[PDB]
Amino acid sequence: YTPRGNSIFGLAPMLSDTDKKPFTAILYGNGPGYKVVGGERENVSMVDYAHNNYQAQSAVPLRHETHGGEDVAVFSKGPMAHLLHGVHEQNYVPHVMAYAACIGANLGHCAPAA
Amino acid sequence: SFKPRYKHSHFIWNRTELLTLDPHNVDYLLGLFEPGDMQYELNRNNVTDPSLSEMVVVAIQILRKNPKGFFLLVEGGRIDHGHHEGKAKQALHEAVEMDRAIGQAGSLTSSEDTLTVVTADHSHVFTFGG
Ligand SMILES: *[C@@H]1O[C@H](CO)[C@@H](O[C@@H]2O[C@H](CO)[C@@H](O)[C@H](O)[C@H]2NC(C)=O)[C@H](O)[C@H]1NC(C)=O
Ligand SMILES: *[C@@H]1O[C@H](CO)[C@@H](O[C@@H]2O[C@H](CO)[C@@H](O)[C@H](O)[C@H]2NC(C)=O)[C@H](O)[C@H]1NC(C)=O
Numbered sequence: 708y709t710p711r712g713n714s715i716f717g718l719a720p721m722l723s724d725t726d727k728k729p730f731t732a733i734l735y736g737n738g739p740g741y742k743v744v745g746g747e748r749e750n751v752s753m754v755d756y757a758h759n760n761y762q763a764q765s766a767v768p769l770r771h772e773t774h775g776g777e778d779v780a781v782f783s784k785g786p787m788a789h790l791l792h793g794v795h796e797q798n799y800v801p802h803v804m805a806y807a808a809c810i811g812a813n814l815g816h817c818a819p820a821a
Numbered sequence: 822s823f824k825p826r827y828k829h830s831h832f833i834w835n836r837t838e839l840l841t842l843d844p845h846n847v848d849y850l851l852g853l854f855e856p857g858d859m860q861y862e863l864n865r866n867n868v869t870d871p872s873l874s875e876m877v878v879v880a881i882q883i884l885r886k887n888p889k890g891f892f893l894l895v896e897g898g899r900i901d902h903g904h905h906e907g908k909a910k911q912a913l914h915e916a917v918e919m920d921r922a923i924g925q926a927g928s929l930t931s932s933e934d935t936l937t938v939v940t941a942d943h944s945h946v947f948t949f950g951g
């Protein structure tokens with residue numbers, strides 16, 4: 708619930724209401740930023756959290772943070788870009804691109820019909 | 822299929838289609854007049870099959886459109902067949918027919934901007950004399 712304009716690498720406005728320590732707006736699900744000094748999670752006001760290499764805190768420790776299964780956006784401009792619409796499967800994308808450039812299996816865009 | 826979006830392609834297969842054509846309306850032409858080699862000029866079906874000269878004319882009539890100019894390859898290829906078979910009268914009639922076609926090419930273009938070149942790939946062991 709950060710205030711408008713808050714730096715993307717900054718802290719959230721008021722502290723945790725559980726352990727009275729602050730937290731960054733950015734947080735990972737898992738990954739190496741999970742840091743627990745003792746049995747407590749790390750008071751971040753000490754360390755340089757807008758540093759280049761600062762690792763935001765996560766829920767689960769891992770060598771490496773993981774991917775996510777959510778969906779992703781497709782941004783499209785140019786000829787036939789509107790064929791890229793709605794929720795689709797990922798393999799749909801090059802089929803549009805091929806169709807519109809008149810390459811691949813379907814050369815329908817370059818048919819003499821209209 | 823590989824032709825640009827708003828262009829006219831035909832495919833013709835007989836002599837009637839070849840002279841029906843309007844060369845102001847055909848961007849891509851494909852014409853395959855026999856299953857294999859075409860008929861010797863002295864054997865040709867006046868009706869279903871065009872002479873070499875007929876094909877050269879509407880070929881130039883199409884290719885004259887492009888304002889950058891054109892390149893055209895013409896092969897009187899059945900002279901080789903005629904000599905290979907030993908049948909001089911066919912081989913010599915094929916050569917005369919390509920000559921006719923060379924005469925046509927001269928009236929449809931001008932020597933000011935067209936370089937044309939007549940040659941042969943090789944010869945035969947054809948002689949004449951006594
Ligand atoms: C997290 O660390 C900060 C900074 O070390 C703590 O804030 C200071 O707290 C002490 C005493 O609690 C005060 O005397 C200081 O004035 C505070 N500010 C600074 C800039 O030092 C904070 O209390 C710590 N939180 C927890 C839960 O340990
Ligand atoms: C030359 O080719 C044309 C077209 O390929 C032939 O025209 C066909 O004529 C028949 C009737 O005899 C029609 O049913 C077909 O629909 C026509 N074809 C097309 C593609 O429209 C013509 O008969 C041929 N002529 C010779 C002498 O072979």
Ligand SMILES: *[C@@H]1O[C@H](CO)[C@@H](O)[C@H](O)[C@H]1NC(C)=O
Nearest residue numbers: 862863864865866867868869
């Ligand atoms: C071709 O047409 C001429 C008409 O003058 C005819 O004499 C000749 O026999 C014909 N030959 C063939 C093979 O069609």
Ligand SMILES: [Ca+2]
Nearest residue numbers: 854855869870
């Ligand atoms: Ca034929």
Ligand SMILES: [Zn+2]
Nearest residue numbers: 900901902905
């Ligand atoms: Zn040969």
